[PDB]
Amino acid sequence: TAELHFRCNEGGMADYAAQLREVGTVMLPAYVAFDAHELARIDALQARLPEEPVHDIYVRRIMVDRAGERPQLVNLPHSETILNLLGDARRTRFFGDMFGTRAEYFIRRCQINRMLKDSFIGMHLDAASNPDYEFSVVIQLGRAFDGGEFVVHPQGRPPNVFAPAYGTVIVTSCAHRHEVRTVRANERTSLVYFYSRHNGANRRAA
Ligand SMILES: [Cl-]
Numbered sequence: 312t313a314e315l316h317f318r319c320n321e322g323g324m325a326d327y328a329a330q331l332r333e334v335g336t337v338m339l340p341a342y343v344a345f346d347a348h349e350l351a352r353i354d355a356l357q358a359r360l361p362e363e364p365v366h367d368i369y370v371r372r373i374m375v376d377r378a379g380e381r382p383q384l385v386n387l388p389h390s391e392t393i394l395n396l397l398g399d400a401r402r403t404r405f406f407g408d409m410f411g412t413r414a415e416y417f418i419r420r421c422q423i424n425r426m427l428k429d430s431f432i433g434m435h436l437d438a439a440s441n442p443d444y445e446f447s448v449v450i451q452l453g454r455a456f457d458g459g460e461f462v463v464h465p466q467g468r469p470p471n472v473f474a475p476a477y478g479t480v481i482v483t484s485c486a487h488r489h490e491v492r493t494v495r496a497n498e499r500t501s502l503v504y505f506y507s508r509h510n511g512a513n514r515r516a517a
């Protein structure tokens with residue numbers, strides 16, 4: 312009956328980490344985390360990747376993280392170039408502060424999701440793929456679309472609704488169920504990746 316809609320956080324690091332802490336999700340405005348020319352590069356690079364259906368959602372894998380296995384680079388060489396940006400010193404410091412820990416974090420899984428009109432992502436928990444995922448990061452590469460809100464459903468709270476634009480970045484804790492609502496026009500393209508302090512094998516049973 313009631314849903315809490317969020318705009319991009321207009322503050323700084325102290326504000327970003329506090330919203331992630333209290334709310335569990337924060338949306339950063341373009342182009343704080345990744346500069347526009349960097350997103351332009353990522354966009355040119357991901358196009359070169361092989362696409363597979365997963366048919367109203369098409370997925371371009373960069374890094375896979377199968378049950379019982381350790382994270383694996385795939386679709387070389389352009390996957391690694393994208394990953395190099397995601398894990399460079401600027402981003403490592405940026406998300407290190409964002410998460411509020413000195414501990415080393417690893418990017419375990421990473422892919423481009425291309426969602427066509429009338430696609431959606433039903434309710435789920437990222438922890439179900441890997442119980443050690445702590446945070447998820449989503450970069451919006453979709454130039455223009457309707458619908459497609461990223462919705463988080465924390466236990467005993469109103470849903471938190473995020474409408475993302477090109478260049479925005481959502482950071483969210485994997486402790487909350489979440490979903491993407493129906494895409495209502497053109498297509499919605501996002502780079503999604505997952506952070507864990509564990510770099511060993513995925514403890515989800517295969
Ligand atoms: Cl910029």
Ligand SMILES: [Fe+3]
Nearest residue numbers: 436437447489
């Ligand atoms: Fe998810």
